[PDB]
Amino acid sequence: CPEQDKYRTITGMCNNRRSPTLGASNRAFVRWLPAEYEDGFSLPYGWTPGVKRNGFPVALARAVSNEIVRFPTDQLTPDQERSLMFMQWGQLLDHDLDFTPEPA
Amino acid sequence: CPEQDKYRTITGMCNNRRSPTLGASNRAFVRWLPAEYEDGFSLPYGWTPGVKRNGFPVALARAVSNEIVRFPTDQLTPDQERSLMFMQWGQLLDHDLDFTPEP
Amino acid sequence: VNCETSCVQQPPCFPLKIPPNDPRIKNQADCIPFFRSCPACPGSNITIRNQINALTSFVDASMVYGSEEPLARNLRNMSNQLGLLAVNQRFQDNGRALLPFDNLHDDPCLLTNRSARIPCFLAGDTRSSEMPELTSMHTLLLREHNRLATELKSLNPRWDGERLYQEARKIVGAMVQIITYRDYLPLVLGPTAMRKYLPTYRSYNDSVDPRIANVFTNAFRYGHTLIQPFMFRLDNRYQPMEPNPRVPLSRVFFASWRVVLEGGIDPILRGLMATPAKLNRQNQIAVDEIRERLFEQVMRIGLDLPALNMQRSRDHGLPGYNAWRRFCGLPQPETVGQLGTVLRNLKLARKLMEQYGTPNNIDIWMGGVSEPLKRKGRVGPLLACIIGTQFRKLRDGDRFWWENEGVFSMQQRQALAQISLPRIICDNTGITTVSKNNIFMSNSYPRDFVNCSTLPALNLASWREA
Amino acid sequence: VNCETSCVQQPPCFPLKIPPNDPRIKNQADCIPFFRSCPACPGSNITIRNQINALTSFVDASMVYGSEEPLARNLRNMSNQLGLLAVNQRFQDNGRALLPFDNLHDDPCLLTNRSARIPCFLAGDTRSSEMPELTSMHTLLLREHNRLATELKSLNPRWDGERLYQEARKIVGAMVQIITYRDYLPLVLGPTAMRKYLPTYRSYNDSVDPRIANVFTNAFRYGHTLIQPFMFRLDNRYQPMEPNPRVPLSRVFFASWRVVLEGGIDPILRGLMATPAKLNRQNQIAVDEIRERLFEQVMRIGLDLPALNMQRSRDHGLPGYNAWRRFCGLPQPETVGQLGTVLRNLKLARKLMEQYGTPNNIDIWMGGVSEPLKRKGRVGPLLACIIGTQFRKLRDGDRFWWENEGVFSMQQRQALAQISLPRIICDNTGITTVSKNNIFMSNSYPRDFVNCSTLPALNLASWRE
């Protein structure tokens, strides 16, 4: 890192001088809790048929969605205290903060 | 991880059921602080000639040892309240806890 | 294997299986496509698999300027010394700048309307064309940069392009920080959690880790609960605009042609200011436009975003509801009864137990959005904790935080405190009537609206160099 | 490579360069060899480089039983159903078991005595032959396991090999835990930090991360300040024992021949009990046997352990003194005078500053062992915090912790509280007089010694099915 800068770098490199990559792009996320995988290190829960998580069957993501998230569109409730702009800024902000690449 | 067990596995696998590798052997150390490398991710301080750490020249490890740690053996102060067995158990215990492999 | 077309579970595909009696997908041989996130350390069996963030975590408007040199460069107009961002050379929006087009190998925007032939936009972040509402915000910020750069030029004629770009970028970045922390986060978190997780700034702390935590990439997805099933466009009188004032969202994804060929960003920005968000409710969590029909127009099948959210948390090896509760210092319900108390809702608790068997296993997103919302906020205690914690690190751990001593002058800080998203909208569009502060609250025209003339502009005087 | 013989800085080599006017190494083109630790993710330019732990973090006597399945089998005696650990077939120690010999490709022990041709030992951990005092401790634990399995066999004739092995292994693991947390840690940390970092055990908490922290592999090296420059060997009378009563440490490293051919483990165990540790003092930090002459007999040049410690912390990307202070909630001295206050030693502070320019840059080991010692502890506030924190995690995060419900029965727990290192030495050696509890404090014969017959044996009755 230069001894003296003036503006952010593009990648975030050098924001933190002691540990220059912190907040920089194309680095691993930090973890706040240790990861929990079927095999403890890489396979996601739901990967192997019949393999329970912590004593119980893993529920299909789609199924939870069907049973808990689904609702009739006509019941929709307008927020009397939030504009749609409140939604949109969240997504714009999300996109300043993280993007998780996956394979093409 | 088996649903019921009775003894440790040899490797430490499965001691923690939710995260079965924790404390198991041949895994990465945990960090309590982000690491500090000359290049931010890999090279050790003192690697590149002239590259300063946080605004100051990196001190040769051997010089610090020479200038700070070195003393005359005949000045040695025996510990009146500790046996040499206190040193030894520390090493033995260390060797229950961590070994960092190198090439 | 191709995760796009195959339902075979083979790295790197982790496809969602279909339950019996699914309301939409009747074929159980079918699946919802899913690629596992890239591993930080490919192949390792020594390292606990982790995922990658391609963006700078700092709130630095990298969604405008990019997060990598080559791209940041391409986004810049380098035909001159005006420090501008490149704008579209083929189309304009009532005389105003649009985003340049990108040159994707597989352009999904082109697919949304074959004859229109409008490709996706090129911006700091790759998702700018995801929905036109998002595109309009990106386009707004682009305009503001160049507007800023044009003013500065007038003030400091001797400033070269590099200097003009940086100074304008530095301002846009602060604006984003200000809107986010002054105006937005308080309405996400509520005043109580706001105090708790974001106490009064003091100054830069170089020991605060600014990285995005893996769990945040899922918890900040709470936003999906706010999504309306239509894109809403209004005219200059804030009335429904023709053509098609209420497009189902399933027909706006990647539809950049609507911005270019159906009236630019004005009608969309007005739609955003004067239409209410969806309210998250324990039996009205997220709409079928994203639950049944995400990206319908560009994928072999329609996606379920909430389900994806949940599969993604498993892919990322995130602990369950209760571990996070514990992390946050919140009680961890063990029984259906105890969960009912946390949720003030025994029916939902029952449904969750029926799905998961234990609150230990509830997926963080699902658990997050299930909790009753905090007063004057739009998340429960769990998500407020996770979200609040992240943003404090981004603030206290950012050496270029706008209030940090030495970054801006005192006078520049005073000038900056004057900015707002509504002003920014007045200065870069044909819209002359906008939301009252707070823009994220105001949602009823004309009750919550004012004339642009009532709002003071950003005063760039203190940027003058002798 | 070759890190053993080149001074070219080429990965994985990271040799220590020699300062002008070094007191030992006059060749300015020479250097002290050094290998960077293996990366957890080799090659990656995405993950911040990190290092690997080959061992189980838990206090489970893995240095006795091994941390990997194949090794753990090779360590077992499987000719029968007695669940014993393999013992040496070539030699015995006045009729007591010795560790089996290993079968190394490149064996350093052989180098310490050409004519003797005695190879390194084989144990749970590969460092067992590093010094005969360490070797003696391993051997001690080897016999104790066998003693327990043997006694369990009498109690429970129907138990097969696997059962006796596991049951004895579990006891040994519990002893290590008890000696460590009951007798050892309190004397490391001092009573204040003992209470702060190791409050009374409640029970297993499965959200407590038991992994070893990178900084710990470096900070626990405080022990190096306790090392005496000789190996002391005493006789049944606790008098200096011929032939060589005081062997310079640079001639015991990897000297497995001394154990096999110079009297076994008793004289070495007596020397440990009745010789004081070195005391760490701010102008007497570590001795030249380890600083000038480490592994002298088995390498082209003598190593400098304290310098190694510091090169290793940089290799590991470890933050400096002040960051660690801050981590621990301790004030961070910015200036020489402030550093002088923290150390209560102005001279030392000036030396450190001369070397590092800023207290932010002081290597963790150096800064850690520089702090004045806590009352009735042997580390300062910084090291106590790091050390204390690590051991609380190993305890609270260990599902098989000896006090954890379901692990042992109530009466078994009661019986285990009777164990002591002195007793273990009485049970597995020819020594009949040993140290008073606390063995780590007692160090003067005969003031601090008792007859073995006064110490109660571990009662195994409640292990009977």
Ligand code: HEM
């Ligand atoms: C803990 C501890 C380590 C780190 C072990 C690991 O994770 O690998 C350690 C290191 C070493 C090293 C490696 C030097 C390098 O970094 O290149 C050597 C050569 C060595 C030698 C000796 N040590 Fe030590 N040390 C740790 C702890 C302790 C303690 C704690 C109480 C004592 C005592 C001790 C003693 C000795 C020793 C005595 C004969 C030798 C030789 N070690 N250690």
Ligand code: HEM
């Ligand atoms: C933050 C955030 C993410 C994760 C960012 C990252 O990749 O690190 C996210 C994810 C997604 C995804 C990916 C789903 C998967 O895991 O496969 C899609 C397809 C998607 C789509 C839309 N989202 Fe979302 N989302 C994040 C945050 C938000 C917020 C925050 C308030 C809102 C609002 C929002 C809205 C939308 C949206 C609107 C048109 C679409 C389409 N997203 N997101």
Ligand SMILES: *[C@@H]1O[C@H](CO)[C@@H](O[C@@H]2O[C@H](CO)[C@@H](O[C@@H]3O[C@H](CO)[C@@H](O)[C@H](O)[C@@H]3O)[C@H](O)[C@H]2NC(C)=O)[C@H](O)[C@H]1NC(C)=O
């Ligand atoms: C089991 O041990 C763990 C760890 O020592 C305990 O969990 C921890 O509890 C603390 C206090 O509630 C949590 O601290 C909190 O952190 C959040 C997030 O930063 C912060 O907002 C709060 O101010 C608070 O400091 C900590 O995160 C949490 N750690 C983990 C890993 O979950 C847990 O309480 C213990 N269980 C029992 C019964 O003692």
Ligand SMILES: Nc1nc(OCc2ccccc2)c2[nH]nnc2n1
């Ligand atoms: N990770 C992710 N993905 C999305 O779409 C998929 C997408 C990825 C790349 C470019 C365009 C579109 C999102 N939409 N909103 N947030 C998103 N996050």
Ligand SMILES: Nc1nc(OCc2ccccc2)c2[nH]nnc2n1
């Ligand atoms: N990491 C480490 N290293 C040592 O020596 C080097 C050594 C490594 C393998 C086998 C024998 C010797 C130690 N001696 N005491 N603790 C040690 N830790």
Ligand SMILES: *[C@@H]1O[C@H](CO)[C@@H](O)[C@H](O)[C@H]1NC(C)=O
């Ligand atoms: C660069 O700026 C000039 C002046 O504004 C403009 O004419 C030109 O179109 C710009 N180039 C791009 C790619 O936007």
Ligand SMILES: *[C@@H]1O[C@H](CO)[C@@H](O)[C@H](O)[C@H]1NC(C)=O
């Ligand atoms: C595609 O764009 C053309 C040109 O604006 C428009 O007339 C047509 O309706 C669009 N396609 C659809 C399906 O709307």
Ligand SMILES: *[C@@H]1O[C@H](CO)[C@@H](O)[C@H](O)[C@H]1NC(C)=O
């Ligand atoms: C900087 O933040 C860290 C992390 O929370 C903390 O240790 C330290 O006390 C903070 N310093 C100040 C001055 O707040």
Ligand SMILES: *[C@@H]1O[C@H](CO)[C@@H](O)[C@H](O)[C@H]1NC(C)=O
């Ligand atoms: C195994 O045990 C038997 C009986 O105690 C003993 O004779 C034999 O030598 C042992 N083998 C090893 C390798 O220790």
Ligand SMILES: *[C@@H]1O[C@H](CO)[C@@H](O)[C@H](O)[C@H]1NC(C)=O
């Ligand atoms: C090697 O060991 C033998 C005993 O076999 C001993 O007589 C001799 O003195 C030793 N040699 C050295 C150099 O210590």
Ligand SMILES: [Ca+2]
């Ligand atoms: Ca950013």
Ligand SMILES: [Ca+2]
């Ligand atoms: Ca162990």
Ligand SMILES: [Cl-]
């Ligand atoms: Cl996380």
Ligand SMILES: [Cl-]
């Ligand atoms: Cl660490």
Ligand SMILES: [Cl-]
């Ligand atoms: Cl173009």
Ligand SMILES: [Cl-]
């Ligand atoms: Cl043998």
